[PDB]
C-alpha cells in the first residue's frame, strides 16, 4: 500500500498534476479479498462500472488512513462513496510476485463517439438498442431455466 501510493504519487507529480487535484483511490480488495490472478480483472470491471455511473465507491474499511501516506499529496483516500457528476478515466494498477508490475488506463466510452460521423453514430445506437432487448430476453431465459 505504501509503495503503490508513492509510485502513483510520483507518476502524477512528474507529469504535472495540478497541485490540489489528487487522484481518488479505490481499494476494492477490502470487499472482495485478493484472488491472486483474478485481481486485475475485478478492478477492471469496477473501473468500467465507475466510468459509466460516475460513482466512486468508498474504501469502507478505512477506519484511519495511515499517517505515513499524508506525504502523498496527489492521493485521496475516501472512506465513503462519492456520487460525482462524471469520471473521465480510471487507472488500474497491480503488482505481482517476481517484479511483475502493470498499469492500465481506461477512458470513458463517450470519447470514442466523438471521432465518428453523426449518421454512423445514430445507425449504431439503433443496433445496440435491438441487442439489449434481445439480450434481456436471453438472460432471463437462462436464469430461470
Amino acid at each position: 500500500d505504501k509503495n503503490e501510493s508513492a509510485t502513483i504519487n510520483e507518476m502524477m507529480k512528474h507529469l504535472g498534476r495540478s497541485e490540489g487535484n489528487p487522484v481518488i483511490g479505490v481499494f476494492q480488495k477490502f470487499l472482495t479479498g485478493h484472488p491472486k490472478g483474478a485481481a486485475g480483472a475485478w478492478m477492471m470491471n469496477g473501473a468500467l462500472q465507475i466510468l459509466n455511473s460516475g460513482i466512486i465507491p468508498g474504501n469502507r474499511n478505512a477506519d484511519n488512513v495511515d499517517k505515513i501516506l499524508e506525504q502523498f499529496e496527489y492521493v485521496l483516500y475516501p472512506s465513503k462513496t462519492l456520487k460525482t457528476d462524471g469520471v473521465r478515466a480510471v487507472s488500474i494498477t497491480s503488482f505481482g510476485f517476481g517484479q511483475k508490475g502493470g498499469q492500465a488506463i481506461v477512458v470513458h466510452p463517450d470519447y470514442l463517439y466523438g471521432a465518428i460521423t453523426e449518421d454512423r453514430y445514430n445507425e449504431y445506437v439503433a443496433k445496440v438498442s435491438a441487442r439489449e432487448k434481445s439480450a434481456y430476453k436471453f438472460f432471463h431465459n437462462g436464469m430461470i431455466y
Binding site: 500500500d1 489528487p22 476494492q28 480488495k29 477490502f30 472482495t32 479479498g33 485478493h34 484472488p35 491472486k36 490472478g37 483474478a38 485481481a39 486485475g40 480483472a41 475485478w42 470491471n45 462500472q49 459509466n52 465507491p57 469502507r60 474499511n61 478505512a62 477506519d63 484511519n64 495511515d66 499517517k67 501516506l69 499529496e73 485521496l76 465513503k80 462513496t81 462519492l82 456520487k83 497491480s94 503488482f95 505481482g96 517476481g98 502493470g102 498499469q103 492500465a104 488506463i105 477512458v107 470513458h108 466510452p109 463517450d110 470519447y111 463517439y113 466523438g114 471521432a115 465518428i116 453514430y121 445514430n122 445496440v128 435491438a130 439489449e132 439480450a135 434481456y136 436471453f138 436464469m143
Partner: protein, 1002 residues
C-alpha cells in the same frame, strides 16, 4: 482375570490408581461448584454475569486522520450542492462549512482552490452556487488557518409536538421553536426564565434559513457584544439554567453571580464557539442516540483528544465512530474507542491504566483533564421490593465504580507528582430522587454522587479532581408524548443537542477555573423543580393522552362496523384500492448513449475521423465469479452497501435459496420463485426478509467453510509423520497384488505369506519398517473471500460431465465467459463469425497458479493411491481453462497466448490482448484472470508471512468483514480469495459495426 491380577502384582502396578485420582477430583469439583453456586445465590445471575471483563488494550481503535477526511468532507459538500441535495437554504451547508474550516491546511486550501476555481459557473445554476460558496469557504479557511478549532452548533432548535389523530393515532414530531432559531436565542430564552420561577432563593439578524452562503461568510467573524445576556435576567427570577452556591447553613441556593458567569459563557459560546484544543477527556455512556454522543461530537469539533467507551463493541459500532470522526474530527483532535464495562472493577482499573501508561509500554501516554461518567443501565418497573441482582449491579456501575474511577486517576496523577492539572468530573446528577415510580436503585445511585461536593474538601484529592455536578433536566431522544404537556406549564424540556451544549458549557475555561476554586453545581433542569406534585401531574398528562387515544380509536372502529352492517359489506368492498407489489426486473445494465448533439460536445470537434478506429481497443463486455456474486451484485454491494430487490433475488438465485417454478403447486397453478428446500412459493417482495440475513452471512470475506473445499479445515490440518515400528506389527489380510507392492517396498522388513485357503496374503510389518502415522496441525488463516455458499456451475447450466472432468477454476472461467458475452449482447458466439474470420478471435486469459486442485490430485492423492483421474495433468495446466472455453463455447482458430503474471496476470492479460488486436492477429479476443483458493495454497502464503493472521486479527477485535483494510494504519497483511473475471475486448471499428455495447476504451 486372576492371571491378570497376579501378573499385575508381580509387575507392582496399581490397576486402580486411575479411579482413585478420578474420585478425588470429582470431589473437589462439587466442592468448587458448590462455592460458585453460593456466590451466584448471593449476587444473582445478572450481577455475576454482568460483571465479566470487556476491556483489552488490543481492541482499542484510534482515529487520527482529520487531514484526509477534510478533503473528503469538502469534495462531498461539493457534489451535493452540484446535485442539489443541499440547496443554498439548507443549514447543512453551514454546518459542513464549520467542519471544513475546523481543518484548515495549507493543503486543504490548495484542494478547494483547485476544485472551486475549476468549476464552470456556466454549466448550470447549481454550478454557480458551488463556485460562489466554494470561493467564500476558501476565503474563510484562509483566515481560520492558524486559529483554534471551535465547537459551534448551528442546527435548527426544536421543541416537542404531540398530536392525536381523528382516529386515535398518537403521533409525535419535533418542530422548530417558533421564537427560537439560533443557539444564541436559546441562551436568551434560558436567562429570562418563565413566570413559574418567581421568588429568588440582542437582535443580530441571521441569514439563517434564507441564504446559507451569506451565513457561511459570517462564520469566521468574532461577535462583539456589550449587552451581556446575564443583564437580561429579571430581578426576582431564576433562569432556566443556573449555577448554585452552598450557604454556610449548608443548602445549595441559586447564585445570580455564578449563574451570570455561566449564562454569559453560554452566549459567548453560541456566537464564537468554544475550543477544546489540548483538552484530554474520558467519556463513558456516549453510545449512539444519547446525550453522550452529542457531547462527543462537540468535544471533537473543538479539537479535543477523547477516549470513548463502548459496551457493545462491534463492527457496526466501530463504523459509527469512524463516521463521526470523519465529520467532526477537528484539527488536532483524536478519538480512541475502547470496549469497556464500567461494572467491572478490573475494567475500571485496566482502562485508566492504559490511558496513563507510556506509549512504549503499550499505553496512551495521556493525562485526563475531564471525566464524564455517564455510563448506565435502565432500571424500570422495579420498586422497593423488586430491587435485586439487576439493581445492585446497576448501582455498581452508576455509583461505586464511578467512585473507583475517580480514585484511580487520583492515584495515577499523584504517583506522578501531578499536582497542577486537575481532571474535571462532570457528575450526572438528578433532580428527582425517587420522585417517580420504580427507578430500581437509580435515585439512590444519583443521590450518593452528591457527597463529592463535600469529600472534595474533607479528603485529599482536590488537586487531582474537581467536581462539577450537572443536574440534567427533561431530555427527549430516541415518553416524549407528554413532553409538550409538561412544557405547557412554563417549564422547559430539552433536545439532546441542547443538553450537550449545556454540558459542554461547563468545560469552558471560565467555569473550569470556577470548579478549581470550589465544587460547582449546575441546574440544567428547565424549571421542572417548580411544577408541584410532579409525579401525579406527569401521570395525569399520560392518562388523559392515552385515554383520548383509546376512546377515539374505539369509537371509530365501531362507527365503522355500524356502516358495514347498515350499508352492506359489498358496497364498501368495491371502495378499497388495490396495492401493487414490486417484482424483480434484473437488468443487463448496458451503457447510456446520449444524443449525438451532446456527444460531440464532450470531445474536440477535431477528433472526428482523426482516429483509425481499427486501432482503438474497446471493452465490449465483462463479468466475474467472486465472493460477492457476479459483476452485478458485487458492484451493488461495493458502491451501495446493500442489495436492491434485484440484488437479493439474484443472490438468492445464485446461492440456491430460491428456484424457479412453473406448473401446478398443490392444485393451483404457479409461476415464479419457490424455496428450493421446501418447494413452497416465495414472492419477490419477501426474498429480503426471508433470505438476506443469511445471504449476507454466507458471502464476502468470511470464515472458511470446509464444505466448500473438500473439507479443508484450517483448525485441523491433516499431515502424516514418519515413524519406525519398534516391534513387529500384527499381521493384516491383503490381496496378492497388494501384498507384493508392500514386499517390493520393505524387503527385509516385511513378511508376506499366502493364505492357502483364500488365495490372499497376510502382511506382517517387522521391526525396523517405516510407518506413516497421521496427525493434525492448527493453522492461523481462518478466513477467506469465498464464492457465496451454494454457488453451483450446475445452475448456470453446466453439464455434470464437465463438472466432473474439470478443475473448479475452469467452472469459474466458463461461467464468466458466458456472462461476459451476455454483457456484450453476443448471445451466440458464432455470431462473431458473421463479422470475422475463424482465425481472428483469440484467448489471452491467464492464471497465477490455477488448476491448484488437479495439482493436488496429482502430487498427493496419487501418493495415497486414492482414486484420481488419468488426466488430472490436463486440468492442472494454466492454459486448459482457455482450452475448454474454446472447446465448449467459442470454436476459434485465433491466437492463444496465455499469461502467468502471478498477482497481476489480469492486467498483463489485457496488455497481451490489446497487442494481439493491434497486430492484426485478432479483432476480438477474451482477456482476464482467474485463480482458486485451496488448502496448500493458503498454507504457503501463511508461511511467506504474506496473508493476515486471523488469530491476531481476532485479538484486535476484528470481524472477518474488517480484515481487509488497505491504506489503513493497522493494515496487517492481505486477505486471500477465489474466483475469476474476464472482459471481452475488440476493435472500436468492429464494435460499432456489430453494434455491441462499449463500456470503455483501453
Amino acid at each position: 482375570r486372576q492371571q491378570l491380577q497376579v501378573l499385575a502384582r508381580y509387575l507392582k502396578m496399581d490397576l486402580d490408581n486411575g479411579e482413585r485420582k478420578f474420585l478425588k477430583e470429582k470431589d473437589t469439583v462439587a466442592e468448587l461448584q458448590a462455592q460458585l453456586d453460593y456466590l451466584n445465590a448471593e449476587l444473582g445471575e445478572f450481577f455475576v454475569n454482568g460483571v465479566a471483563t470487556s476491556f483489552s488494550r488490543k481492541k482499542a481503535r484510534t482515529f487520527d486522520s482529520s487531514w484526509n477526511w477534510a478533503k473528503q468532507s469538502l469534495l462531498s459538500l461539493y457534489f451535493e450542492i452540484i446535485h442539489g441535495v443541499l440547496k443554498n437554504v439548507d443549514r447543512e451547508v453551514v454546518s459542513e462549512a464549520i467542519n471544513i474550516m475546523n481543518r484548515s491546511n495549507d493543503a486543504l486550501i490548495k484542494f478547494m482552490e483547485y476544485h472551486i476555481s475549476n468549476t464552470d459557473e456556466t454549466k448550470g445554476e447549481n454550478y454557480q452556487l458551488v463556485k460562489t460558496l466554494g470561493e467564500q469557504l476558501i476565503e474563510n479557511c484562509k483566515q481560520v488557518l492558524d486559529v483554534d478549532p471551535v465547537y459551534k452548533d448551528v442546527a435548527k432548535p426544536t421543541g416537542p409536538k404531540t398530536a392525536i389523530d381523528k382516529n386515535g393515532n398518537i403521533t409525535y414530531s419535533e418542530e422548530p421553536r417558533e421564537k427560537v432559531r439560533k443557539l444564541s436565542q436559546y441562551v436568551q430564552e434560558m436567562a429570562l426564565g418563565g413566570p413559574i420561577t418567581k421568588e429568588s432563593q440582542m437582535d443580530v439578524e441571521d441569514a439563517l434559513d434564507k441564504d446559507s452562503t451569506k451565513e457561511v461568510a459570517s462564520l469566521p467573524n468574532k461577535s462583539t457584544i456589550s449587552k451581556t445576556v446575564s443583564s437580561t435576567i429579571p430581578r426576582e427570577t431564576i433562569p432556566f439554567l443556573h449555577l448554585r452556591k452552598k450557604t454556610p447553613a449548608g443548602d445549595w441556593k441559586y447564585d445570580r453571580q455564578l449563574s451570570s458567569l455561566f449564562l454569559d459563557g453560554l452566549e459567548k459560546a453560541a456566537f464564537n464557539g468554544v475550543t477544546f484544543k489540548d483538552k484530554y477527556v474520558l467519556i463513558t455512556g456516549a453510545g449512539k442516540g444519547s446525550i453522550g454522543a452529542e457531547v462527543l461530537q462537540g468535544l471533537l469539533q473543538g479539537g479535543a483528544k477523547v477516549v470513548v467507551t463502548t459496551s457493545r463493541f462491534s463492527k457496526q459500532v466501530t463504523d459509527y465512530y469512524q463516521s463521526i470522526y470523519a465529520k467532526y474530527g477537528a484539527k488536532g483532535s483524536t478519538l480512541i474507542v475502547v470496549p469497556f464495562n464500567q461494572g467491572s472493577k478490573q475494567d475500571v482499573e485496566a482502562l485508566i491504566e492504559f490511558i496513563y501508561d507510556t506509549e512504549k509500554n503499550g499505553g496512551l501516554g495521556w493525562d485526563l483533564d475531564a471525566i464524564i461518567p455517564f455510563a448506565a443501565i435502565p432500571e424500570q418497573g422495579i420498586e422497593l421490593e423488586h430491587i435485586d441482582s439487576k439493581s445492585e449491579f446497576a448501582h455498581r456501575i452508576m455509583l461505586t465504580n464511578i467512585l473507583r474511577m475517580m480514585g484511580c486517576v487520583k492515584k495515577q496523577k499523584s504517583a506522578r507528582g501531578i499536582e497542577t492539572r486537575p481532571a474535571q468530573v462532570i457528575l450526572p446528577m438528578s433532580p428527582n430522587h425517587g420522585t417517580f415510580g420504580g427507578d430500581g436503585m437509580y435515585s439512590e445511585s444519583k443521590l450518593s454522587l452528591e457527597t463529592l461536593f463535600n469529600r472534595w474538601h474533607s479528603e485529599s484529592w482536590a488537586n487531582q479532581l474537581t467536581v462539577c455536578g450537572a443536574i440534567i433536566g427533561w431530555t427527549r431522544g430516541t415518553n416524549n408524548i407528554i413532553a409538550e404537556g409538561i412544557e405547557k406549564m412554563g417549564v422547559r424540556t430539552f433536545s439532546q443537542k441542547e443538553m450537550a451544549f449545556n454540558l459542554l458549557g461547563l468545560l469552558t475555561p471560565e467555569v473550569v477555573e470556577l470548579c478549581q476554586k470550589s465544587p460547582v453545581m449546575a441546574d440544567l433542569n428547565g424549571g421542572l423543580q417548580f411544577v408541584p406534585e410532579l409525579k401525579e401531574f406527569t401521570a395525569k398528562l399520560r392518562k388523559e393522552l392515552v385515554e383520548t387515544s383509546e376512546v377515539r380509536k374505539a369509537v371509530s372502529i365501531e362507527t365503522a362496523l355500524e356502516h358495514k352492517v347498515v350499508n352492506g359489506n359489498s358496497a364498501d368492498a368495491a371502495y378499497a384500492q388495490v396495492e401493487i407489489q414490486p417484482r424483480a426486473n434484473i437488468q443487463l445494465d448496458f451503457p447510456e448513449l446520449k444524443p449525438y448533439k451532446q456527444v460531440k460536445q464532450i470531445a474536440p470537434a477535431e477528433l472526428e475521423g482523426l482516429l483509425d478506429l481499427e486501432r482503438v481497443i474497446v471493452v465490449t463486455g465483462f463479468a466475474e465469479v467472486g465472493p460477492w456474486g457476479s459483476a452485478r451484485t458485487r458492484w451493488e454491494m461495493e458502491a451501495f452497501g446493500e442489495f436492491s430487490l434485484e440484488g437479493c433475488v439474484e443472490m438468492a438465485w445464485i446461492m440456491g435459496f430460491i428456484s424457479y417454478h412453473n406448473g401446478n403447486l398443490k392444485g393451483r397453478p404457479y409461476t415464479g420463485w419457490v424455496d428450493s428446500k421446501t418447494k413452497e412459493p416465495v414472492d419477490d417482495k419477501d426474498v429480503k426478509a426471508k433470505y438476506e440475513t443469511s445471504i449476507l452471512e454466507h458471502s464476502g470475506i468470511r470464515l472458511i467453510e470446509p464444505e466448500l473445499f473438500n473439507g479443508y479445515n484450517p483448525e485441523k490440518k491433516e499431515m502424516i509423520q514418519e515413524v519406525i515400528v519398534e516391534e513387529d506389527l500384527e499381521p493384516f489380510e491383503a490381496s496378492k497384488e497388494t501384498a507384493e507392492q508392500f514386499k517390493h517396498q520393505h524387503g527385509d522388513k516385511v513378511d508376506i505369506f499366502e493364505i492357502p485357503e483364500t488365495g490372499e496374503y497376510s502382511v506382517k510389518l517387522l521391526k525396523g519398517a517405516t510407518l506413516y502415522i497421521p496427525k493434525a496441525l492448527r493453522f492461523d488463516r481462518l478466513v477467506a473471500g469465498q464464492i457465496p455458499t451454494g454457488w453451483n456451475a450446475k445452475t448456470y447450466g453446466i453439464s455434470d460431465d464437465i463438472i466432473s472432468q474439470v478443475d473448479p477454476i475452469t467452472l469459474f472461467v466458463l461461467v464468466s465467459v458466458v456472462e461476459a458475452f451476455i454483457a456484450s449482447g453476443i448471445t451466440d458466439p458464432y455470431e462473431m463469425y458473421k463479422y470475422v474470420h475463424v482465425s481472428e478471435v483469440g484467448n489471452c486469459s491467464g492464471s497465477g497458479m490455477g488448476g491448484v486442485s488437479a495439482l493436488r490430485g496429482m502430487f498427493k492423492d496419487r501418493f495415497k493411491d486414492e482414486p484420481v483421474q488419468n488426466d488430472i495433468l490436463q486440468e492442472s495446466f494454466i492454459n486448459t481453462m482457455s482450452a475448454w472455453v474454446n472447446m465448449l463455447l467459442i470454436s476459434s482458430s485465433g491466437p492463444i497466448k496465455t499469461p502467468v503474471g502471478a498477482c497481476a496476470t489480469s492486467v498483463e492479460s489485457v496488455d497481451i490482448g490489446v497487442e494481439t488486436i493491434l497486430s492484426g492477429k485478432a479483432r476480438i479476443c477474451i482477456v482476464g484472470g482467474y485463480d482458486d483458493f485451496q488448502e496448500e495454497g493458503s498454507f504457503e502464503f501463511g508461511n511467506m508471512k504474506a496473508t493476515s493472521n486471523t488469530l491476531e486479527e481476532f485479538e484486535h477485535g476484528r470481524t472477518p468483514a474488517e480484515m481487509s483494510r488497505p491504506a489503513t494504519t493497522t493494515r496487517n497483511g492481505f486477505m486471500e480469495a477465489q474466483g475469476a473475471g474476464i472482459q471481452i475486448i475488440m476493435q472500436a471499428d468492429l464494435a460499432l459495426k456489430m453494434g455491441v455495447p462499449i463500456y470503455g476504451i483501453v
